[PDB]
Design a protein around this ligand. Structure first.
Ligand SMILES: O=NC(=O)CNS(=O)(=O)c1ccccc1
Ligand SMILES: [Ca+2]
Ligand SMILES: [Ca+2]
Ligand SMILES: [Ca+2]
Ligand SMILES: [Zn+2]
Ligand SMILES: [Zn+2]
Length: 158
């Protein structure tokens, strides 16, 4: 399947959810990228203008792609595998309530999973994997990838 064929990857935050402090959105997304750069040769840079490899978007309902969102609950986010254009992009449902903690839906934890997709990972059948298709809050301060996640990503990079 598609992978990025270069080590320096850019991302851009298209718009910010009103659910969170701006700096907290920046940090959650940065930390989520760091999870993957920790176990690959990839380096991620936030850019403020221009065309990024990975565009991070908050949107609700129909938002121009073919994966319309569904209101509060259900689908929380979706992302596209590596490629030109929309490839790599990660979309977060604004009808969720995004947070830094265990309330609402945790942006960091959701973003770790979405960026996994942005890098070319699919879903895991292992409930312990961040790439498992079901969202479940785990303590974000001690968060770690499962062996399955690490095997998955290192089958694609490094
Ligand atoms: O990547 N998106 C999905 O897998 C769709 N399911 S979900 O939005 O409920 C979701 C999102 C993120 C992590 C687990 C599950
Ligand atoms: Ca939803
Ligand atoms: Ca893109
Ligand atoms: Ca919201
Ligand atoms: Zn979308
Ligand atoms: Zn997913």
């Amino acid at each position: 399947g598609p992978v990025w064929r270069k080590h320096y990857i850019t991302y851009r935050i298209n718009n910010y959810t009103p659910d969170m402090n701006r700096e907290d959105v920046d940090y959650a997304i940065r930390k989520a990228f760091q999870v993957w750069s920790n176990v690959t040769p990839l380096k991620f840079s936030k850019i403020n203008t221009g065309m990024a490899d990975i565009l991070v978007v908050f949107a609700r309902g129909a938002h121009g792609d073919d994966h319309a969102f569904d209101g509060k609950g259900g689908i929380l986010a979706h992302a596209f595998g590596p490629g030109s254009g929309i490839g790599g992009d990660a979309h977060f449902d604004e009808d969720e309530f995004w947070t830094t903690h265990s309330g609402g839906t945790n942006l960091f934890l959701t973003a770790v999973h979405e960026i996994g997709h942005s890098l070319g990972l699919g879903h895991s059948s292992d409930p312990k994997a961040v790439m498992f298709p079901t969202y479940k809050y785990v303590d974000i301060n001690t968060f770690r990838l499962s062996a399955d996640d690490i095997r998955g990503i290192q089958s694609l990079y490094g």
